[PDB]
CSV table of C-alpha atoms in Angstrom, one decimal:
chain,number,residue,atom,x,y,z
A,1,UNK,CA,6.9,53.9,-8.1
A,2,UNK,CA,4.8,50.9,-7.8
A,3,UNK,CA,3.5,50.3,-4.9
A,4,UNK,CA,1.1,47.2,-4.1
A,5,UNK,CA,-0.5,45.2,-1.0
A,6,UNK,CA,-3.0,42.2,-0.4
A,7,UNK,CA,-4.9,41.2,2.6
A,8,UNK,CA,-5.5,37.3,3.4
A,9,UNK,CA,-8.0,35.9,5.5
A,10,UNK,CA,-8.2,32.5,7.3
A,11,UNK,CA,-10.0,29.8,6.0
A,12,UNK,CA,-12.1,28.9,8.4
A,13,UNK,CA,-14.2,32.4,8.0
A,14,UNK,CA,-14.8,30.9,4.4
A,15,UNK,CA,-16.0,27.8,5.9
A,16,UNK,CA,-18.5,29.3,8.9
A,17,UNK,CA,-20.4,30.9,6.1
A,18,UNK,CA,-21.4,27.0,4.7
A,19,UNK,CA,-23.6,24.7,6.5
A,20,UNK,CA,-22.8,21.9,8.4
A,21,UNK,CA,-23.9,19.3,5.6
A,22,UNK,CA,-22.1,21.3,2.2
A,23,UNK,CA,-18.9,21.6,4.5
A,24,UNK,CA,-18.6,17.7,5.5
A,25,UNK,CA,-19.5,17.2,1.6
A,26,UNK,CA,-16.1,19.3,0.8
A,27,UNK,CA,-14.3,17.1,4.1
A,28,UNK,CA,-15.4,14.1,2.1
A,29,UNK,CA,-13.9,15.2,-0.8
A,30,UNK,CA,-10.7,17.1,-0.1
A,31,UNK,CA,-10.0,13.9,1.8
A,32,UNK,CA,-10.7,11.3,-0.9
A,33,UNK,CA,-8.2,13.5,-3.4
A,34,UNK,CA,-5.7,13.9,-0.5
A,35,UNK,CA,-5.7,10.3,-0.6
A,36,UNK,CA,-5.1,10.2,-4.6
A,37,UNK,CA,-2.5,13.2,-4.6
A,38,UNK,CA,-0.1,11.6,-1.9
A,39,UNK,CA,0.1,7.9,-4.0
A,40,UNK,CA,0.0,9.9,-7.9
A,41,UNK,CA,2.7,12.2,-5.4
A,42,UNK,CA,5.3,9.5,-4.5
A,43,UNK,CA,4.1,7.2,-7.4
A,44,UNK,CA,6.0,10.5,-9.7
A,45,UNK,CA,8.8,10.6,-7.4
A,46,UNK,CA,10.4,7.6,-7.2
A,47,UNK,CA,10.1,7.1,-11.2
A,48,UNK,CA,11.4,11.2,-11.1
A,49,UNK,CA,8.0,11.9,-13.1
B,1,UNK,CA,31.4,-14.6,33.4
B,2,UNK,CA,27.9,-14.3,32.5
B,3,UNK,CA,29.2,-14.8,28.7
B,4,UNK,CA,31.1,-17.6,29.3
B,5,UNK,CA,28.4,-19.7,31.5
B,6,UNK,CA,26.1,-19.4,29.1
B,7,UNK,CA,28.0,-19.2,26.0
B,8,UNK,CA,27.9,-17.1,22.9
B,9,UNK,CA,24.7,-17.8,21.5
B,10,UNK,CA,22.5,-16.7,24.0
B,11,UNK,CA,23.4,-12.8,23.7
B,12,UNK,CA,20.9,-12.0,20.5
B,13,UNK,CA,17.7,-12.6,22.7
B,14,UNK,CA,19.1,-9.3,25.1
B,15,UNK,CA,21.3,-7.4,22.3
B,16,UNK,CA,17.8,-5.6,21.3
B,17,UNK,CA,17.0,-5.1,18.3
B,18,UNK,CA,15.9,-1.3,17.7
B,19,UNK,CA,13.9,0.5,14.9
B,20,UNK,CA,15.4,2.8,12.2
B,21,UNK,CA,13.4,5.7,11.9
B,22,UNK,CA,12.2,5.6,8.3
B,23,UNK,CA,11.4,8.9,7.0
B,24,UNK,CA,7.0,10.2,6.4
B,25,UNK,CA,6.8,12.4,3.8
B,26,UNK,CA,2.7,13.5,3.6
B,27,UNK,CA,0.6,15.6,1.7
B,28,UNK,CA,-1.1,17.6,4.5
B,29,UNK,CA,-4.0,19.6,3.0
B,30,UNK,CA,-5.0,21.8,6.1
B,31,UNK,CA,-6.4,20.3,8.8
B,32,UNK,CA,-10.4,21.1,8.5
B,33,UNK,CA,-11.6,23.3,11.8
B,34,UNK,CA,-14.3,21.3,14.2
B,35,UNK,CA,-17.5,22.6,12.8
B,36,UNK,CA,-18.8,22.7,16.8
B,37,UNK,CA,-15.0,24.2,18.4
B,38,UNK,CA,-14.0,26.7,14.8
B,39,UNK,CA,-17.5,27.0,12.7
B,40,UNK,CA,-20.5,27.1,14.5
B,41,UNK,CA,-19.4,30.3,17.1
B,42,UNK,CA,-18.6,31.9,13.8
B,43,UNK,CA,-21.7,30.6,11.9
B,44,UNK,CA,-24.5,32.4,13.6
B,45,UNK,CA,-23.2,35.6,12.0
B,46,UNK,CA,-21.5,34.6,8.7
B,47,UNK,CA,-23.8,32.3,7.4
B,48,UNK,CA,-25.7,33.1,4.1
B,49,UNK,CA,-23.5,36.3,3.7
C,1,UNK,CA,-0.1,-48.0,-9.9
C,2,UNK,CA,-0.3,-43.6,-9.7
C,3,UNK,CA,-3.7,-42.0,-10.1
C,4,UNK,CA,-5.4,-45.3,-8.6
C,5,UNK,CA,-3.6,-44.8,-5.1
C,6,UNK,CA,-5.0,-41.1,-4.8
C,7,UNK,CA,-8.7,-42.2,-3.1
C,8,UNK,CA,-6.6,-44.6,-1.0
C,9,UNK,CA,-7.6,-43.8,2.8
C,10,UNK,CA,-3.8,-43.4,3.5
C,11,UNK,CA,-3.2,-41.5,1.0
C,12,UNK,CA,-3.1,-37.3,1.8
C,13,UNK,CA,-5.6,-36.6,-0.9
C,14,UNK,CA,-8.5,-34.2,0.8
C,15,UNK,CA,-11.8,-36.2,1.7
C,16,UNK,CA,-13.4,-33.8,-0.5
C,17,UNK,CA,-10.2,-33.9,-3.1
C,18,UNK,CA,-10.8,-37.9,-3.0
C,19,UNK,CA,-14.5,-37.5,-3.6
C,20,UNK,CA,-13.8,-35.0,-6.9
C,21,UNK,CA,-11.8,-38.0,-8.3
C,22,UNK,CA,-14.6,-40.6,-7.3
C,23,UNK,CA,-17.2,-38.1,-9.1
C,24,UNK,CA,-14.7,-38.0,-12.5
C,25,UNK,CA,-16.2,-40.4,-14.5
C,26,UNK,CA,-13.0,-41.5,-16.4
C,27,UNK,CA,-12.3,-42.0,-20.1
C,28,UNK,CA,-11.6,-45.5,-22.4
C,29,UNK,CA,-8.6,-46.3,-24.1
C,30,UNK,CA,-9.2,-44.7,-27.5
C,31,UNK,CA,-10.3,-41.3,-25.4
C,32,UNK,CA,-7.9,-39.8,-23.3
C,33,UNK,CA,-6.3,-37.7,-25.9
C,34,UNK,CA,-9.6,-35.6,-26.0
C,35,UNK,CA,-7.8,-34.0,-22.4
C,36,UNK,CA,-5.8,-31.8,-24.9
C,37,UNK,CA,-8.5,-30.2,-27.0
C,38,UNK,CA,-10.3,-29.6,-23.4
C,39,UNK,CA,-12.3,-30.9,-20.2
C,40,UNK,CA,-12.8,-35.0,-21.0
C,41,UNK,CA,-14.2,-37.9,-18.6
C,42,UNK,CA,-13.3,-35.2,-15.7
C,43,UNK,CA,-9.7,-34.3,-16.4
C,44,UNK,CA,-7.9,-31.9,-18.3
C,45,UNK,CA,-4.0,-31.3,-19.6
C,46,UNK,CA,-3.0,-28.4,-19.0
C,47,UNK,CA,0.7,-26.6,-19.5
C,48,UNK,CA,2.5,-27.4,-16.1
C,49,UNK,CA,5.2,-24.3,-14.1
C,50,UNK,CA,7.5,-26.4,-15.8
C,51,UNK,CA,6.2,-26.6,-19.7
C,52,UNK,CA,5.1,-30.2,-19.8
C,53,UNK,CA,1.7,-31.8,-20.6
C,54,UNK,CA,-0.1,-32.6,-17.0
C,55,UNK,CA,-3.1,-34.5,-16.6
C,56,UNK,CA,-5.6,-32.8,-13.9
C,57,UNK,CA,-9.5,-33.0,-12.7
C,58,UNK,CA,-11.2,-30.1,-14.8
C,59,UNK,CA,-11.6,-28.0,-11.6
C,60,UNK,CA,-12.6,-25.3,-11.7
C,61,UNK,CA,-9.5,-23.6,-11.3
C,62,UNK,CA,-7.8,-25.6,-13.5
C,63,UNK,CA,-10.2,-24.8,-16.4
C,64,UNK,CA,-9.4,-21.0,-15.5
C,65,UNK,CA,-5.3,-22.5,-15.5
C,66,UNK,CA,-6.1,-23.7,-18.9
C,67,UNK,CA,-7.9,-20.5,-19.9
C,68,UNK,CA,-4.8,-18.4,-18.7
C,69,UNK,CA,-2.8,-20.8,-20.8
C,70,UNK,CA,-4.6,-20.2,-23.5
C,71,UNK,CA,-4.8,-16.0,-23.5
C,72,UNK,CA,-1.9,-14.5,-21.9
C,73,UNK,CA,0.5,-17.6,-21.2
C,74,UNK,CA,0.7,-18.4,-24.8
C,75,UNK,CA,1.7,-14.9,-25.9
C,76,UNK,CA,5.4,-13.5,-26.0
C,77,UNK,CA,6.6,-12.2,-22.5
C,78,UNK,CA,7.1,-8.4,-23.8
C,79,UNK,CA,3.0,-9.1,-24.9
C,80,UNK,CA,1.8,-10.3,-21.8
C,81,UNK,CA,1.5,-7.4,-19.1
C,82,UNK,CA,-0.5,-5.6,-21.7
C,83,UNK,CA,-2.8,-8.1,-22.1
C,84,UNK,CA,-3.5,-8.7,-18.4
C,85,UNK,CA,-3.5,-5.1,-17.9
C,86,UNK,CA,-6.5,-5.4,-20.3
C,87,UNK,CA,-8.3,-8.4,-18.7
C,88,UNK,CA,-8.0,-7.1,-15.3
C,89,UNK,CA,-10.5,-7.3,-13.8
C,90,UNK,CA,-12.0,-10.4,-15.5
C,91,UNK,CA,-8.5,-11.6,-14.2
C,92,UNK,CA,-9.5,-11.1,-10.5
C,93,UNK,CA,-13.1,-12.2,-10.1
C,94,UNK,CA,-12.0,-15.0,-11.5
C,95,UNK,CA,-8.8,-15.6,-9.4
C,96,UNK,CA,-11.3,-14.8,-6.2
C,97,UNK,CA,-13.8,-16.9,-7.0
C,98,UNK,CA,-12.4,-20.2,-9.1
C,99,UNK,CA,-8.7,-20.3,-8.2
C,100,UNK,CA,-6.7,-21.6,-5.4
C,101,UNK,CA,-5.0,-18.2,-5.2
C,102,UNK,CA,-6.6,-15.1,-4.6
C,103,UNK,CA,-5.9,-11.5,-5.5
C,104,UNK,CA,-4.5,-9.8,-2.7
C,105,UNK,CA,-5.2,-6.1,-3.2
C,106,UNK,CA,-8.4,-5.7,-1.0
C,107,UNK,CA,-9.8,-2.8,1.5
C,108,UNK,CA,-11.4,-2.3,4.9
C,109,UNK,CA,-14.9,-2.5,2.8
C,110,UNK,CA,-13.9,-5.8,1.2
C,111,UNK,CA,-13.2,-4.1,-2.2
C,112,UNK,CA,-10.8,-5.6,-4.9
C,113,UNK,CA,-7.8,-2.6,-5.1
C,114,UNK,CA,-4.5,-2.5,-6.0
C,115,UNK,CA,-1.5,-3.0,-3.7
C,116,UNK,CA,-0.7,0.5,-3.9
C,117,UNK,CA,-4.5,1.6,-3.1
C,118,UNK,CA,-3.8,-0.1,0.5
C,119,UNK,CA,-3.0,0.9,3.4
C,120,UNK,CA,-0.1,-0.4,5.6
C,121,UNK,CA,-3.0,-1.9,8.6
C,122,UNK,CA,-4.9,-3.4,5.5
C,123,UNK,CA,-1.8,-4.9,3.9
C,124,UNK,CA,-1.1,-7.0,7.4
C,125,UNK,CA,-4.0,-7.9,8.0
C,126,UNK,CA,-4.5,-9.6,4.7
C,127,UNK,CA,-1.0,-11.3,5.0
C,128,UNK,CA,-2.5,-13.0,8.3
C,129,UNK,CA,-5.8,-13.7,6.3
C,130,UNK,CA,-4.3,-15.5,4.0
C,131,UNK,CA,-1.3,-16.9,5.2
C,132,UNK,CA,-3.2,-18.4,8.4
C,133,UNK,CA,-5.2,-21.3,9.0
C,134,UNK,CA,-7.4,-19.4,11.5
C,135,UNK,CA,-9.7,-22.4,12.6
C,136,UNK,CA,-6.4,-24.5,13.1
C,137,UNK,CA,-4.5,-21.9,14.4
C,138,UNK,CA,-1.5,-22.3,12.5
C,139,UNK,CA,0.6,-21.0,9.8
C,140,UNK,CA,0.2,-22.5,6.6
C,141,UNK,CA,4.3,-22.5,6.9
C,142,UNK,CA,7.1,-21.3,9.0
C,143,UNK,CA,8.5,-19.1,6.6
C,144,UNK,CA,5.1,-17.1,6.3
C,145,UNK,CA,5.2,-16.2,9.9
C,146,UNK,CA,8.4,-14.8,9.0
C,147,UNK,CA,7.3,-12.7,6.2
C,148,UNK,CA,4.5,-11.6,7.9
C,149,UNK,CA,7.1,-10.6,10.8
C,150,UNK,CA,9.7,-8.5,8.3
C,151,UNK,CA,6.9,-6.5,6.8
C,152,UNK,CA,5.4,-5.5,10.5
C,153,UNK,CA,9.3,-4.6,11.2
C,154,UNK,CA,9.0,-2.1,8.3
C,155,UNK,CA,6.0,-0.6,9.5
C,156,UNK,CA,7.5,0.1,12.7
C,157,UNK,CA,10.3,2.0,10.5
C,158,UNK,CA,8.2,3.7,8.6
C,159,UNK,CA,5.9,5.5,11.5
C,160,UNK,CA,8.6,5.9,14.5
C,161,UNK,CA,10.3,8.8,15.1
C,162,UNK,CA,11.8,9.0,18.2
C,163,UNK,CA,15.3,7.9,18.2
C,164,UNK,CA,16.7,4.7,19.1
C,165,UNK,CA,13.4,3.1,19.9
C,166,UNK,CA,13.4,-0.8,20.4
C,167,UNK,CA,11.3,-3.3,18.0
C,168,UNK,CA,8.5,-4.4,19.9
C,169,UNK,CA,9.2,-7.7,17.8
C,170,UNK,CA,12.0,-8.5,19.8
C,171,UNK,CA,11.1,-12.5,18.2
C,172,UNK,CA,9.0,-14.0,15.9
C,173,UNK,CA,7.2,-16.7,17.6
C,174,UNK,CA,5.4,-13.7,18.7
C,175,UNK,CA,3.4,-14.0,15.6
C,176,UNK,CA,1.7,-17.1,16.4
C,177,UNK,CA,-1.0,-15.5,17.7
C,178,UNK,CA,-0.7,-13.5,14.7
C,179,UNK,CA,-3.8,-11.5,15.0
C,180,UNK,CA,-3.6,-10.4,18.8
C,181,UNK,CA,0.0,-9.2,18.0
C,182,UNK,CA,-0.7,-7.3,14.8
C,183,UNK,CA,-3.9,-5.6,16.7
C,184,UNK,CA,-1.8,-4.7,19.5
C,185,UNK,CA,0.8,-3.1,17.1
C,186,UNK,CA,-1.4,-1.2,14.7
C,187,UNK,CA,-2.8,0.2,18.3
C,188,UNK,CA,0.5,2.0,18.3
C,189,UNK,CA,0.9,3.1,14.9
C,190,UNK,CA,-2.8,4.2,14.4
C,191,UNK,CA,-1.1,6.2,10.9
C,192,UNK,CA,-0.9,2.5,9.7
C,193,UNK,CA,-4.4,2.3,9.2
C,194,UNK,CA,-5.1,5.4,7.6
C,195,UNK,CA,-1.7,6.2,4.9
C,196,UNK,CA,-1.4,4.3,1.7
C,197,UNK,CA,1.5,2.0,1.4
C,198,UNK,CA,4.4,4.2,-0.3
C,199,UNK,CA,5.3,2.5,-3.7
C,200,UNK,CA,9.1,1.8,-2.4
C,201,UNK,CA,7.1,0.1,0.4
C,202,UNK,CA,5.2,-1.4,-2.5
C,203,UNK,CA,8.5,-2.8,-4.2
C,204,UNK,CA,10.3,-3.8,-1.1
C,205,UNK,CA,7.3,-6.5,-0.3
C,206,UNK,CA,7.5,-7.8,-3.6
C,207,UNK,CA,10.9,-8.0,-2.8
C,208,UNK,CA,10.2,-10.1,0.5
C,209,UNK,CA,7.9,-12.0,-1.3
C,210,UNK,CA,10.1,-13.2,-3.9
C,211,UNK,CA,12.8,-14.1,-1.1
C,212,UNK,CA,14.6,-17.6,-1.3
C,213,UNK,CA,14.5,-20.7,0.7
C,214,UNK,CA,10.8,-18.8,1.9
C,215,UNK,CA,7.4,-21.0,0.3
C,216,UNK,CA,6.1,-18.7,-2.4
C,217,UNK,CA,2.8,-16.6,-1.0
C,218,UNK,CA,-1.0,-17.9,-1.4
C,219,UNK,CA,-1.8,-15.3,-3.7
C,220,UNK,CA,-1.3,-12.8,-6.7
C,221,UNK,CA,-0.1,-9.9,-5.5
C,222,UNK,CA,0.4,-7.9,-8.8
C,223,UNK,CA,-0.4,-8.5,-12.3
C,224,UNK,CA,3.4,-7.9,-13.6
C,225,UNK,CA,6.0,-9.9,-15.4
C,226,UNK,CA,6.2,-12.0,-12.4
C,227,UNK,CA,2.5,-13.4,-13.2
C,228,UNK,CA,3.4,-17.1,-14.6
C,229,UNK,CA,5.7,-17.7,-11.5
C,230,UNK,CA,3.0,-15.9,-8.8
C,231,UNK,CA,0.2,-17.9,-10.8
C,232,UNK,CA,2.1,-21.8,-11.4
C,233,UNK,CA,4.8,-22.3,-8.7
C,234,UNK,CA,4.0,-24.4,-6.1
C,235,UNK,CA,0.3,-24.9,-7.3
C,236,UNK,CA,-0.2,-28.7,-5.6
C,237,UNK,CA,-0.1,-28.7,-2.5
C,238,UNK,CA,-3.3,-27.2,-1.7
C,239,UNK,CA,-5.5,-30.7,-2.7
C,240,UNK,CA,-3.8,-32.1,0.1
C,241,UNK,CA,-4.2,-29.7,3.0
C,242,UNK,CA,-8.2,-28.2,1.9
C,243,UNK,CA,-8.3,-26.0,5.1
C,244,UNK,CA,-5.4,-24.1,3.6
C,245,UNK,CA,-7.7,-22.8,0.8
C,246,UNK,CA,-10.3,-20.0,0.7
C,247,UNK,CA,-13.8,-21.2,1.5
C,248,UNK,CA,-12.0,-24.7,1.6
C,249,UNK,CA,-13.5,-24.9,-2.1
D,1,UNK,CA,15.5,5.3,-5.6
D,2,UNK,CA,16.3,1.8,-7.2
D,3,UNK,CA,14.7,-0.4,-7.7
D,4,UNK,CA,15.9,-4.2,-9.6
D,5,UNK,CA,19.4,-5.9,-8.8
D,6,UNK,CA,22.1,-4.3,-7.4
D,7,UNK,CA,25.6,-6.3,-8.1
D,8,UNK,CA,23.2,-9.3,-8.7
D,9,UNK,CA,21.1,-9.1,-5.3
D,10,UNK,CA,17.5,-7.6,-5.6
D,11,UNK,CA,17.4,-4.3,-3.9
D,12,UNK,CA,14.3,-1.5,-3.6
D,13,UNK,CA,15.5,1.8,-2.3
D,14,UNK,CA,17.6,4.1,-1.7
D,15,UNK,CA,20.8,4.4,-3.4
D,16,UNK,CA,23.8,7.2,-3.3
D,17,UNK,CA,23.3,8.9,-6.8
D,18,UNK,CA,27.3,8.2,-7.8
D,19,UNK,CA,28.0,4.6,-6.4
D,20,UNK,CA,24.5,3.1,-6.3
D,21,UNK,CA,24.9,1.9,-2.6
D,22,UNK,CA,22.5,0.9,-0.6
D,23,UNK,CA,21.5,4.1,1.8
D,24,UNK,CA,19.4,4.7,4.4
D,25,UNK,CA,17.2,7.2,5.3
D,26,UNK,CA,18.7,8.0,8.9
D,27,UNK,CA,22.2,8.7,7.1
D,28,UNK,CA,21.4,11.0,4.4
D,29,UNK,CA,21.1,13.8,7.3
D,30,UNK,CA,24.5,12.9,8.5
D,31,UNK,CA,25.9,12.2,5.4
D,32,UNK,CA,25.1,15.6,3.4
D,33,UNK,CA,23.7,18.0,5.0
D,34,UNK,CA,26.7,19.9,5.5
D,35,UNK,CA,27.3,20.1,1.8
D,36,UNK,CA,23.6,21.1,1.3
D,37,UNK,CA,23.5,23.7,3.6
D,38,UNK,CA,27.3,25.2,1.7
D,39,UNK,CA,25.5,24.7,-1.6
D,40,UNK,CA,22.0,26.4,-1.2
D,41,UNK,CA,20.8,29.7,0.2
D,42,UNK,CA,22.9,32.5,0.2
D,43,UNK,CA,26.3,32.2,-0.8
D,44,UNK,CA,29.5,32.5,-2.6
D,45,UNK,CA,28.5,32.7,-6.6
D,46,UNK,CA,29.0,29.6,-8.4
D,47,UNK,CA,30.1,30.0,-11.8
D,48,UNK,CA,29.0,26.5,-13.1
D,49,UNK,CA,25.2,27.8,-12.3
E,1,UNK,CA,-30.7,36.4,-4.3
E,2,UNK,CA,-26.8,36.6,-5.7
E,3,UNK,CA,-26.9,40.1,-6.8
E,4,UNK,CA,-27.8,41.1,-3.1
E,5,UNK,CA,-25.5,38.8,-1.7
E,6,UNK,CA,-22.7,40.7,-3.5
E,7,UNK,CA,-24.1,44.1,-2.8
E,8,UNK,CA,-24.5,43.6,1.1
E,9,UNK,CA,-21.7,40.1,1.7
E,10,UNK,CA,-19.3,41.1,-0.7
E,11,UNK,CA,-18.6,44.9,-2.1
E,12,UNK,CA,-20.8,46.7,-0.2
E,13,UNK,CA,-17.9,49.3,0.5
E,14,UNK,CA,-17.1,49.5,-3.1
E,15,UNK,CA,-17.2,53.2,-4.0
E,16,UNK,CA,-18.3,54.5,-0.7
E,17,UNK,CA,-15.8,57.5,0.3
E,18,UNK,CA,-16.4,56.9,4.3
E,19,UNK,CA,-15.6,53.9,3.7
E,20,UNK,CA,-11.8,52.2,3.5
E,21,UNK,CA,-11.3,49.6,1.2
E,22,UNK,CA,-8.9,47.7,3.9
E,23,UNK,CA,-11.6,48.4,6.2
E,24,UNK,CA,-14.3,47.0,3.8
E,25,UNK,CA,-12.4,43.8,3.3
E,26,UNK,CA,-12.1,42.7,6.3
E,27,UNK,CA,-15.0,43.8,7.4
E,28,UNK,CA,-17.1,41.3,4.5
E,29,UNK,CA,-15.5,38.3,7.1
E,30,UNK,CA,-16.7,40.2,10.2
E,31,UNK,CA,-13.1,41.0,10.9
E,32,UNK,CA,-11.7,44.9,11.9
E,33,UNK,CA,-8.4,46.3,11.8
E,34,UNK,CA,-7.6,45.1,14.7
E,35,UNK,CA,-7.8,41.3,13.2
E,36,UNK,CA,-4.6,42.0,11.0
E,37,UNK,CA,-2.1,40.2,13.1
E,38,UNK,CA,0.4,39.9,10.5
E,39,UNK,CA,2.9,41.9,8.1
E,40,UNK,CA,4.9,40.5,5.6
E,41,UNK,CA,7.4,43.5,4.9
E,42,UNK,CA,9.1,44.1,1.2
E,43,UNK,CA,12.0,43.9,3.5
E,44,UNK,CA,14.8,44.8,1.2
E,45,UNK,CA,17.4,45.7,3.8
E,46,UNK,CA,17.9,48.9,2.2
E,47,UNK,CA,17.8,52.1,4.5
E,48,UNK,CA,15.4,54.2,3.0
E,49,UNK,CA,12.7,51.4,2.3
């Protein structure tokens, strides 16, 4: 008799309570580590690591 | 005929050569909203909240 | 007659070459062996690709030759990529600024990175930078224009998608205006200049690079157990064509 | 992946996971996809697994 | 200035009977009930679920 639910929200409601300069701060950053994930990413895969 | 005449060699510069699609694999992190298209109509009222 | 036929005017020797052996003041008979134990009347031995004694002016590269001779050369093989590992980036400042060949690992911004911290745009456009004689609008050698040429043909794999597309290098004579072609093909792959090259990618350049028959490259493209043969082969050459080198130095 | 000599010729790559021949990328759709899609997803239960 | 942000911007609705929690969740983002355009169902293929 367990019953449960959850309720997600789109990220860009997050994002339009920041201002313009804190969210290009986060761009900046979330793009620098996308950069480092996809080399570590591949780097992992082709040595199956 | 148009083998012949000019013999053999010649085909390679029309036989064209043509790209193998090599696969892309990427690490897309979701693509960040425009702040002026996605944010700012949403901003006046979520800002600060 | 050898060493005394170098400053001839006929000979190929560099102007400036001919005026470094001019400015080497020379050594007497009961002298020369000081060249072992280091720089002596100008010149220096140094441990050749080929494990001999070789007399050269104490250039500045070659004192950094003799110096690599010394610290990782000298060690067991198994030692070695450990050791340059350590002196990295002593290793390339010092290849950049007092060697005849460069590191090649560098970004839009001019920074020293690795060949894996590049992307595929960068990594072309530093194979025409180096490989090119831009002022004399040729290549250094045939077979670099062909190297240059393979690697675009695997960036074209590695961003089409749509079927059965033909190469737009159709030939490779097409390369020699190598930097109007390469723009006008990373215009059509803009991904080329944003993704990092994928390490396979990585390997299968090496791979080129190391191809037979082909001149070995200008530079030291990675600081592996290829080192001694990336650093030594072919090392000569460049005091006889000057505009071939960086800064013509 | 491999990655070294393959019967004495340097290779970087891909290789079939039995034979170690060269493959590429545009045949490994052809080439197995029909056994992936029998072996994953619903199905038949495998006793090996 | 953080405690009011979570007492107006974040639980406001907590332990309010006229208000629904559902309600009061999406209404933190601006959003109504109307805004939940998507259901992923438990889905069990059974008949009585």
């Amino acid at each position: 008799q367990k019953g449960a639910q959850c309720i997600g929200v789109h990220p860009k409601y997050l994002y339009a309570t920041l201002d313009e300069q804190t969210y290009n701060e986060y761009c900046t950053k979330v793009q620098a580590r996308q950069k480092k994930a996809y080399r570590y990413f591949h780097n992992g895969l082709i040595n199956n690591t | 005929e148009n083998k012949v005449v000019n013999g053999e060699a010649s085909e390679a510069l029309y036989k064209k050569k043509i790209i193998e699609r090599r696969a892309n694999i990427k690490f897309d992190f979701p693509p960040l909203p425009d702040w002026k298209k996605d944010i700012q109509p949403l901003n006046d009222k979520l800002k600060g909240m | 007659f050898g060493s005394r036929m170098m400053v001839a005017k006929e000979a190929h020797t560099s102007p400036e070459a001919k005026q470094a052996i001019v400015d080497a003041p020379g050594l007497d008979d009961s002298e020369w062996e000081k060249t072992y134990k280091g720089p002596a009347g100008g010149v220096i031995t140094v441990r050749s690709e080929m494990g001999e004694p070789i007399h050269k002016l104490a250039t500045r590269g070659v004192l950094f030759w003799a110096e690599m001779d010394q610290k990782i050369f000298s060690l067991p093989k198994e030692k070695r990529v450990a050791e340059l590992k350590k002196n990295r980036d002593y290793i390339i400042r010092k290849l950049n600024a007092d060697f005849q060949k460069v590191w090649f690992g560098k970004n839009k911004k001019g920074e020293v990175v690795d060949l894996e911290d590049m992307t595929y745009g960068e990594v072309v456009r530093r194979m025409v930078e180096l490989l090119y004689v831009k002022d004399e609008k040729r290549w250094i050698d045939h077979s670099f224009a062909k190297l240059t040429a393979d690697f675009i043909h695997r960036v074209e794999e590695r961003f089409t998608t749509a079927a059965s597309q033909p190469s737009l290098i159709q030939s490779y004579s097409d390369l020699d205006e190598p930097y109007s072609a390469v723009e006008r093909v990373l215009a059509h792959y803009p991904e080329a200049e944003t993704q990092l090259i994928s390490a396979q990618d990585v390997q299968h350049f090496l791979l080129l690079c190391k191809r037979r028959g082909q001149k070995p490259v200008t530079f030291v493209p990675a600081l592996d157990e290829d080192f001694e043969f990336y650093f030594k082969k072919d090392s000569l050459w460049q005091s006889e064509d000057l505009a071939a080198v960086i800064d013509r130095d | 992946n491999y990655n070294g000599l393959i019967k004495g010729k340097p290779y970087s790559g891909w290789v079939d996971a039995k034979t170690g021949e060269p493959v590429d990328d545009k045949d490994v759709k052809p080439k197995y996809e029909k056994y992936i899609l029998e072996h994953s997803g619903i199905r038949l239960i495998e006793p090996e697994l | 200035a953080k405690e009011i942000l979570r007492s107006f911007g974040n639980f406001f609705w907590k332990n309010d009977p006229t208000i629904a929690p559902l309600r009061g969740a999406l209404a933190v983002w601006g959003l109504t009930i109307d805004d939940l355009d998507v259901a992923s169902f438990h889905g069990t293929s059974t008949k009585a679920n």
